[PDB]
Amino acid sequence: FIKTNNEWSYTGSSFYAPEPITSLNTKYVAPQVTYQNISTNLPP
Amino acid sequence: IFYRLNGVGITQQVLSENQKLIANKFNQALGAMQTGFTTTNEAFQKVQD
Numbered sequence: 001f002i003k004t005n006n007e008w009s010y011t012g013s014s015f016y017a018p019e020p021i022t023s024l025n026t027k028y029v030a031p032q033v034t035y036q037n038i039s040t041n042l043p044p
Numbered sequence: 045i046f047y048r049l050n051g052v053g054i055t056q057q058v059l060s061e062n063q064k065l066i067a068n069k070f071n072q073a074l075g076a077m078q079t080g081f082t083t084t085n086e087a088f089q090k091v092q093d
């Protein structure tokens with residue numbers, strides 16, 4: 001998860017690839033206090 | 045370490061509630077081997093060999 005200046009955005013694990021966020025590239029996970037949170041730029 | 049515990053089969057919950065005690069267990073595990081640098085460490089024996 002990398003934020004650009006043209007927003008948090010998906011990239012691959014082996015190249016600087018700027019891509020948007022979809023459901024086809026992530027998984028779900030349990031809550032954890034140790035990271036960040038957003039309220040308006042919600043990924044689908 | 046936390047993600048390592050997630051990978052090996054320890055859930056996020058129990059590590060999220062038992063940070064300090066497993067930390068101290070890791071510390072004493074690291075400290076016990078310090079004074080053990082003797083014949084009891086077989087690798088120490090092999091290096092001397």
Ligand SMILES: *[C@@H]1O[C@H](CO)[C@@H](O)[C@H](O)[C@H]1NC(C)=O
Binds near residue numbers: 032033036037
């Ligand atoms: C949401 O993310 C922020 C930023 O990392 C963090 O400070 C906060 O604790 C998170 N929320 C919860 C409920 O942990």
